[PDB]
């Protein structure tokens, strides 16, 4: 959990939401990443799971950004 909390911060600032998605999406890219990091498999599983939520949380911001922006427009039309 310590390693997970630390990892969450790292992927929030240094890694962009766009970059985070390419990693999480492609199995080939994830394998190369966990191998370079020399992660035990259990930690790799924990990391992907924790990162899935972070991505979803950032996509919720973008989906809300698209929705708020439409309502932002629709209000000015009246």
């Amino acid at each position, epitope marked *: 959990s310590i390693f997970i909390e630390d990892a969450i911060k790292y992927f929030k600032e240094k890694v962009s939401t766009q970059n985070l998605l390419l990693l999480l999406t492609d199995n080939e890219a994830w*394998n190369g990443f*966990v*191998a370079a990091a020399e992660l*035990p*498999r*259990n930690e*790799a*599983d924990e990391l992907r799971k924790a990162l899935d939520n972070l991505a979803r949380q950032m996509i919720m911001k973008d989906k809300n950004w698209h929705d708020k922006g439409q309502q932002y427009r629709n209000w000015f039309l009246k």
Partner: antibody
Amino acid sequence: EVMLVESGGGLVRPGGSLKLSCTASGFTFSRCAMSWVRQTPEKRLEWVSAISRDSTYTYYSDSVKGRFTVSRDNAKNTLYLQMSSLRSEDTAMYYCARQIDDYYVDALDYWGQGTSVTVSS
Amino acid sequence: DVQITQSPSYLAASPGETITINCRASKIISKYLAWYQEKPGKTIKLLIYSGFTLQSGIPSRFSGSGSGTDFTLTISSLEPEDFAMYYCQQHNEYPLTFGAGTKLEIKR
């Protein structure tokens, strides 16, 4: 059927050198990570080394680090283990083994019959 | 290194019976524990990987269970060919580490 055949084993003196080879058959060798495992006279299994499918990463046990070098020739379907500064404790049956491809480190789904190495004066 | 304690070292049983072999890892390794069978004149065979998944072609007599650091291999309805040497191994991280093994002998 998957087949692994080790060779290059034999007699060696303390401080001597041996290069083991493992020819792989019945599958696409270049697709799979490989490991070297040995069984001592006390029938203890001991993992020694491993190499990724493309030799990007190599791994060694502490007992062997700095003395052994794992390599591979995908074109010749062959796995190698160059052993240097051999000790009496290196006396064992040496197996090569194919790793399952779910994770870069994984279980060993196929083993060779093994090649014997005896380190003695 | 992950230290693995395999027990018992020896097992005496008869055909038709059920036995279990245990393995405890020195740290949490999730499910990534493998079971191997060794018989004379034969290559070492993978029975089960990732704790509970049978390898293709392995008989249904074998099954894998576990909890936390502990893992258990079951062999039920024992056949004569099942009497052999058994080893556990974690494949969660390098270096791969093995249990000291279990010899399953014929009771008489």
